[PDB]
């Protein structure tokens, strides 16, 4: 039971926040990438566990740039946006609003990277602030280490949140 409906998700964020690493994580390295563009396939079971279950082959696109470098020719037919910020760089979170303007009804997900580089002391403060940040985009938030494959393991809280986001992208479209 495989769906042929297109689902295109853009991965946006400042240079170096972890976008390519995140695409590799979320797609289990089913990724084709080069200096210009990176696309991954994230296989997603929509409404899993019901007679309505269908498998979707979601595209995750990472084309880089900066909010001067514009890649708008890659922003066509987008159904959802993952906004990526580096939890050790507060400036990368301030730029998510501008990134979102490069492309309302399009669902958004906010993902913070490099959680492993935040000490248990300063962690509570960063996470309170990222909850507020996600609220600004009417979005759920996931904070993780992109280099740890357990970060989005099947059945984890993070995976449930990502799955909820993909379900919404499919429904809105
Ligand atoms: N410790 C740690 N390192 C990370 C994490 N995510 C990314 N990195 C590291 O940060 C560096 C940048 O990550 P990368 O995935 O290349 O960013 P990018 O957003 O794709 O960078 P770009 O210039 O091509 S646009 C890499 O060395 C990568 O290994 C993370 O969650 N934890
Ligand atoms: Mg990249």
Curated annotation (Swiss-Prot):
InterPro entries registered for this protein in UniProt: P-loop_NTPase
Binding sites annotated in the UniProt record for GTP: 16-21, 114-116, 145-146
GO molecular function: GTP binding; protein homodimerization activity
GO biological process: B cell differentiation; natural killer cell differentiation; protein stabilization; regulation of protein lipidation; regulation of Ras protein signal transduction; T cell differentiation in thymus
Region spans: Small GTPase-like: 2-173
Keywords: GTP-binding, Nucleotide-binding
CDD domains registered for this protein in UniProt: RabL3
Summary of the knockout phenotype: Embryonic lethal.
Quaternary structure note: Homodimer. Interacts with GPR89; the interaction stabilizes GPR89. Interacts with RAP1GDS1.
Entry similarity comment: Belongs to the small GTPase superfamily. Rab family.
Function field: Required for KRAS signaling regulation and modulation of cell proliferation. Regulator of KRAS prenylation, and probably prenylation of other small GTPases. Required for lymphocyte development and function. Not required for myeloid cell development.
Protein name: Rab-like protein 3
Taxonomic lineage: Eukaryota, Metazoa, Chordata, Craniata, Vertebrata
